């Protein structure tokens with residue numbers, strides 16, 4: 007029952023072995039969700055489930071630098087369902103973010119922003135009831 011959009015500070019940025027967990031429930035008739043791992047105004051890793059892009063469900067990932075989006079990476083495996091509880095786990099690995107949803111691997115996103123210790127905030131937005139957002143080292 008956290009307020010959305012939600013800003014989770016990531017003190018000292020991210021680092022390999024850091025696991026970020028987001029628990030929530032998708033709203034009925036959801037349109038979109040976004041996680042934005044931010045380095046100041048830049049978005050190192052945007053993770054964006056879209057429930058209706060041309061009547062298809064797709065996950066779009068990208069990076070925003072100096073207010074410009076780059077090349078999208080798209081994943082049609084789509085583990086979310088309107089109305090249902092989810093867990094997103096984002097594990098920082100040395101050369102990529104590794105994302106699992108509901109304990110099943112979903113995608114990896116290679117690091118474009120390389121100053122990992124400056125990726126100091128996670129924004130959580132869109133059509134969810136947000137239960138919790140936290141991090142730990144594994």
Ligand SMILES: OC[C@H]1O[C@@H](S[C@@H]2O[C@H](CO)[C@@H](O)[C@H](O)[C@H]2O)[C@H](O)[C@@H](n2cc(-c3ccccc3F)nn2)[C@H]1O
Nearest residue numbers: 038039040052054066067068075076077078131132133
């Ligand atoms: O690349 C990734 C970006 O994509 C564009 S749309 C893109 O536009 C291109 C140019 O026309 C096309 O070339 C390309 O096909 C098409 O995907 C989105 O607006 C961006 N966004 C989403 C959101 C957001 C806000 C609130 C809640 C959830 C959210 F997700 N805030 N910003 C971002 O997701």
